[PDB]
Each structure stands twice: as C-alpha cells, then as structure tokens.
C-alpha cells in the first residue's frame, strides 16, 4: 500500500517571475528581484583568485553601480548597492511588476521549504528539502546555482527563507537567510569548515509514524509509553533532536487515537532495529516529512 | 556523503497559467486550457449516483454548451464539447494568451515526469514521479485533484503526458494520456479493478548505481559481468523489467569506466541482499531515478 506521501514542492511560478541574472566582472549567478531591490550572494564581487579569504568590505567599497549587471530572461540598471551579511542589496531603477506579497523569515531545523534551482537567472528545477539539524540541506546544486532561493507559502504570501551559497564537503548544502546570516556556523569563504553532526528530527519521525498509522500500518504501536522528557534525555545520547510537540502533531494524535508518548516509545525500539519488518516500505526511520506534510497530503488539512 | 540526487520537478509556472476549473452540474475538477481547448476528465459529466457504471456516450449526448462552466482564478464561455477516450475536449471562445509551446506525448514505464496537483483550478503543489511498470504512479492526490496534469519539458516545449483520473486500491494513481487512453488497462469507472504487478525498473536501478559510483560509492562493483540477454531472462523471473540500454546510460558508462554488464551483475547479487551495507544511504535497490536524472543533477548534462 502506497502512503500517498511524496516530496511536495510549492508551485514555483510566483518565484520564477522574480529571478534575474546578476553579473559582476567575471562572476555570474542568480538574484531575487523584489520591488526595486535585487538580492544575491555577495561572493559575486569576488575575483576567482580570492574566494578562499576575501575582503568583502574592501570589495564592496571597490564596487560602483556600473559594476553590477542585472538581466531577466529585460535589463535592469543599478542605482544602488549595499551589503547585509553574506548578501548583496542591489537597488535597481525598475520595480518588479510581478512582485508577489512576500515576507522574509528564517527556517528552523526540521521544517521544510521549497527550492527553485536556477542557473544564469533561468529557473531549471524545483524541489523541497528539510532544514537539517546541523543547518544544512540535502539539495541538488551545481556550479552557478548560487542565488537560488528557498521559500515557504502561507496563503498568497511567500516567505523567503534561503538563498543558496555553498556545498559542504559531504555533498550537502547551506545558504543564508535574507537578513544576511548564513544558516548554522558556516561562512561564505572557500576554505574547509567544520560541519556539525546531523541528527534525526524527532518531530518528523513522529509525523512519519502517524502517516503509517494513517495508512493502516501500525504493528509498531504498543501500549508502552515514553514521556517527552524521558525521550529527550534519550535523544541527546542517540543523535535525535529533542521532541517539541506542536498543534499539527496534536492533530495527528487526535485523528488516530495514538498518543505521542506511544510513538516516542516506538522510535526508541525502532532505533534498535526494524527486525526485518517495514514501515511505508522503509527499513529505516524517516525524518524528511513534517507534520504539516502529513496533515496536508493525507488529510487535506493545510 | 550526500548523493546530490533529489526528486527534481520542472518549474511549474508555465503550466499553472493553463489550469482552470471545469464544473458540470454537481461535479467540479480541473481542466487544462491550451489555445481554444480545455481538456478535463470525462467523469465530470457523471452524476454521483452513476460513477460505478456510467454511460459516457449518453451523458455526452445529454450535455449542451451551457452545461459546462469554465473558470480561471476570468470565466470562459463554452462553444463546443467533444469526447476523446476518457477525456473531454471543451471548446471555449477565448484562446489562452499564456499558452506555451506544447506537444502531447505518452510516457513509457520507467520515465519520469512532473505533476502539478491542483484543486478547483488552483495549483496546490508540484512533484515528480516515475511511470511504474504496471502503468501506475506513486503520487499524492486527494478528492478533487482530477484534472491535475503531468508533463515533461524539452527546451521551451512542454510535453503533456498525464491527466489524473483515479486512485487504485493500493493508494497508487493512474490517469490518461491526452489521446484519451488510460495508462495501462484501467477504466474511469468506480468499480474494483485488477492491478498488474509492479516491477523494479532495471534501467533506473542501473542509473542509481552509476550515481553511487559518481559519488565514490562503488564497493558493489566487481569485475564479474552479466550479459543484457542473461540479465533479461533473469529479470522475467524476479519482478525486474528487462533492461534496454540508452544513450544516457551509455553516457554514464563512459564517464565512470564501469560497464552496464558489471552493474547488471551487481543488481543480481544486491537483489539477494545488501549484507548490511548501504548504497547512497539506502539498504534496498532504488528505481525512482532515471538516467536523465543522474545525468542532469550530478553531471549538468541535460
Ligand atoms: C555558487 O554558485 C557555488 C555553488 C556550489 C557549486 C558546487 N555546488 C554548489 O552548490 N558556491 C561555491 O562555489 C562556494 C563559493 C564560496 C565563495 C562560498 N564555494 C564552495 O561551495 O566551495 C566548496 C565549499 C567551500 C567551503 C566548504 O566546506 N566547501 C567544500 C570544501 C571541501 C574541502 C576543500 C575546501 C572546500
Ligand atoms: C477525481 O478527482 C478523483 C481523484 C481521486 C480521489 C481520491 N484520490 C484520487 O486521486 N477520482 C475518483 O474519485 C475516481 C472517479 C471514477 C469515475 C474513475 N474514482 C476513484 O478513484 O475511486 C476509487 C477507484 C475506482 C476504481 C478503483 O480501483 N478504485 C479503488 C477501489 C477500491 C475498492 C472499492 C472500489 C474502488
């Protein structure tokens, strides 16, 4: 029995109309054109012989408005440039007429968002990821994908949360919020950096076990229970995030009649081994589906 | 090490501009508005007390142009109606000004395409699936999602290949090509139907093993080889599709120096068991990534 759970991305059309190409010398990447501002990563000002330890403050001071070319596939003339964190704030003389209602927000570990992978300002593909506990994502990015944006949707409002910056040694990726901060402790310099450990997202595993119950698969459900506090002490020693219940998880507990504490106990035993059995066709715990994913895709509850 | 392989969907914006709502009495679903034609499933003419054995020819004869309401979220006045297979061909008096360059094509088993899940003509999410060998897909569809379209992209041309129709007993889904034929042997009537067996897509497993080699994971690669003909005889008895090499798989063999016949042998042994080891973090064979997926996402080769 198929679970009905796919990696679901938002429709990207609203964001595709906001993507441009930002070129600064010998560097090209993607920018996000909202109103009169174009956001893009600041290492577009970096000469290829300086990516390892660049001086972005001196590079910015060296830049003029004629140093930035912005193109949409229209050409946008630049009249202002500023730098917030790892991001450039380019002011263009034309406001984007396709600008959607938008906010900026930072995504927390475990939460999912949609990514629009672009190259030379041309959207190539879209996909959805979960912010890993070590503030990376398991994305699909190649050379020139920087400036690709990640977002969630709330009604007609688009919450921009991620602008792609770099690929770590292990093949995962990270980027910046639109306040300029890189996610985690990473820096936009091409030097080897320490990567924090990854962890199972406990809340996302609980959501996934609820989806199995929602699909009739419930052999793991036993009357035994583990308190949230006892599970969290257990989680610290077993590479699991500590569990924080939400109203979306409560919705899953209500519809199923299975308490969170039962699934916490289930996770503790399933972590020792699936014993040959399978859950939704998987032999390992799944933490890539959020409670909102299970609520929306199985129950039509947004 | 992360593989860089995500479930990648095309950007949906071009298709979102083609989605409308088609209502016919007490039935509503989604339609695809291209030029002066709106396509939608023909069970929009079905009264809810007739979904099990409907007479679509009599239902069509009973329909007039005033029986079809088409809305985009503009209202489209209907001036013609026809029925090809399981699909309605509604003629509207306004041509879609956002009509992209498009063809219709049928998708073969193993090949992937992008789906735009809509409800009441409003695009809600996008996701990519592979046509299963039994002509189903493991999608994410709820009540009212019928009329959602599946497509591939070749340049600026959109190849429409799937319009959602039904959910089988096992939770998988199927639909129709735009010639009117349902995929497989299914019929758009709400009666229980036989479902053909599913099979591993051999070509997609070979592509996935090449992606592991592309990521440095190659412990399964032994000098032992299995001819394509010997593997195909083996595949018929082991729920694998027969392997048909393509120029995209040849590209993978060239870049890696690993022959198809070695991976065919690898699949034969891996099918007996992974022996505790993992490939790209998986303990079972993966057939949900096509050679084009591995070519594009890992090698930038479209
Ligand atoms: C921007 O388009 C680009 C996107 C990259 C290309 C490959 N996949 C992507 O997602 N980003 C960079 O090339 C980026 C620019 C820097 C100025 C931040 N550098 C980068 O990703 O280089 C590899 C990164 C640099 C830090 C790091 O940990 N890392 C890998 C290590 C591996 C061990 C040697 C040193 C680099
Ligand atoms: C159209 O919006 C809708 C989409 C469905 C709703 C649930 N998920 C979807 O993808 N399609 C239908 O409701 C469809 C309409 C029919 C006129 C074709 N009927 C349907 O999917 O019903 C269940 C299907 C009918 C054939 C079949 O095998 N099947 C399940 C069996 C299960 C055993 C009892 C009989 C139905």
């Amino acid at each position: 029995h198929h679970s009905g759970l796919v990696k679901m991305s938002h429709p990207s059309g609203d964001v595709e109309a906001c993507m441009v190409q930002v070129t600064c010398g010998s560097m090209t990447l993607n920018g996000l054109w909202l109103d009169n501002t174009v956001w893009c990563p600041r290492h577009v000002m970096c000469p290829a012989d300086q990516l390892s330890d660049p001086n972005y403050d001196a590079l910015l001071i060296s830049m003029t408005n004629h140093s930035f070319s912005v193109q949409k596939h229209a050409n946008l003339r630049v009249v202002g440039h500023a730098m917030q964190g790892t991001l450039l704030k380019l002011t263009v003389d034309v406001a984007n007429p396709s600008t959607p209602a938008y906010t900026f927000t930072t995504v927390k570990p475990g939460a999912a968002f949609s990514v629009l992978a672009c190259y030379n300002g041309r959207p190539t593909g879209t996909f959805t990821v979960v912010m890993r506990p070590n503030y990376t994502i398991k994305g699909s990015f190649l050379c020139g994908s920087c400036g690709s944006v990640g977002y969630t949707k709330e009604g007609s409002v688009i919450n921009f949360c991620y602008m792609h910056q770099m690929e770590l040694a292990n093949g995962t990726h990270t980027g910046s919020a639109f306040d300029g901060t890189m996610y985690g402790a990473f820096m936009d310099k091409q030097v080897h950096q320490v990567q924090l450990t990854d962890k199972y997202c406990s809340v996302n595993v609980v959501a996934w076990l609820y989806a199995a119950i929602l699909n009739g698969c419930a052999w793991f459900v036993k009357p035994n229970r583990t308190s949230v506090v006892s599970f969290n002490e257990w989680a610290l020693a077993n590479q699991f995030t500590e569990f924080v219940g939400t109203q979306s998880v409560d919705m899953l507990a209500v519809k199923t009649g299975v308490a969170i504490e039962q699934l916490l106990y289930a996770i503790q035993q399933l972590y020792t081994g699936f014993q040959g059995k399978q859950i939704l066709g998987s032999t390992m715990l799944e933490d890539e589906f959020t409670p909102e994913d299970v609520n929306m895709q199985i129950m039509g509850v947004v």
Side-chain angles (χ1 to χ4, degrees), chain A residues 1-48 50-52 54-65 67-88 90-121 123-153 155-188 190-198 200-221 223-232 234-238 240-246 248-254 256-276 278-301:
Chain A
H1 195 258
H2 176 239
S3 70
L5 266 181
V6 309
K7 307 290 271 282
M8 179 79 89
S9 291
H10 291 289
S12 59
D14 274 8
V15 181
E16 314 167 16
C18 296
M19 302 309 301
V20 294
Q21 190 191 250
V22 176
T23 314
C24 179
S26 161
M27 290 278 344
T28 205
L29 39 74
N30 314 287
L32 176 70
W33 181 22
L34 308 169
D35 301 315
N36 287 94
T37 300
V38 169
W39 303 80
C40 71
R42 69 179 176 171
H43 72 266
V44 75
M45 309 166 323
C46 205
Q50 256 210 41
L51 257 54
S52 302
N55 196 302
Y56 286 110
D57 282 298
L59 277 178
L60 174 64
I61 280 311
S62 94
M63 279 331 148
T64 76
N65 286 335
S67 302
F68 294 104
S69 176
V70 180
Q71 300 186 159
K72 169 190 225 332
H73 328 278
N75 312 36
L76 300 179
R77 130 177 182 261
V78 194
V79 306
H81 59 289
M83 162 152 96
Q84 181 157 3
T86 59
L87 284 193
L88 267 188
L90 301 187
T91 298
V92 295
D93 81 306
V94 191
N96 187 1
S98 305
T99 300
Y102 74 99
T103 78
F104 297 133
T105 206
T106 57
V107 45
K108 272 132 205 282
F113 62 104
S114 288
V115 169
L116 181 58
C118 312
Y119 299 89
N120 307 37
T124 300
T126 204
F127 65 99
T128 185
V129 291
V130 155
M131 183 52 81
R132 305 303 332 208
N134 62 350
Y135 284 111
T136 71
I137 60 168
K138 307 164 157 213
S140 174
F141 297 100
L142 299 173
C143 274
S145 62
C146 283
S148 291
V149 301
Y151 56 102
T152 61
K153 269 189 147 172
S156 211
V157 193
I158 304 180
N159 315 135
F160 290 104
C161 51
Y162 176 94
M163 175 175 258
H164 183 57
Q165 293 268 12
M166 65 198 306
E167 184 188 280
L168 305 316
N170 67 354
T172 65
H173 308 102
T174 192
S176 35
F178 285 83
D179 63 359
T181 73
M182 292 283 299
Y183 280 101
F186 304 97
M187 189 54 57
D188 54 330
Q190 210 163 297
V191 299
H192 158 73
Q193 297 173 28
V194 178
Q195 205 187 335
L196 264 52
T197 207
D198 204 0
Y200 286 104
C201 186
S202 304
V203 178
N204 287 7
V205 178
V206 171
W208 175 74
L209 294 178
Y210 272 128
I213 293 153
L214 284 207
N215 273 278
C217 189
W219 50 276
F220 49 85
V221 179
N224 313 63
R225 284 161 73 121
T226 298
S227 77
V228 174
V229 293
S230 315
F231 174 85
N232 282 355
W234 173 88
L236 293 183
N238 294 262
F240 279 75
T241 61
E242 307 174 77
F243 176 90
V244 180
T246 73
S248 293
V249 174
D250 298 339
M251 183 151 346
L252 288 185
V254 154
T256 67
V258 189
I260 283 144
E261 287 85 356
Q262 303 179 263
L263 291 184
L264 297 179
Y265 188 100
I267 295 166
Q268 291 184 298
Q269 306 317 137
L270 292 176
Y271 186 66
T272 79
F274 274 41
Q275 274 137 347
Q278 282 141 252
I279 303 170
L280 300 179
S282 195
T283 36
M284 30 198 274
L285 295 176
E286 201 65 20
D287 70 351
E288 284 195 16
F289 295 108
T290 81
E292 295 71 12
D293 289 322
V294 178
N295 268 127
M296 178 273 152
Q297 284 188 43
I298 319 284
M299 303 215 287
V301 169

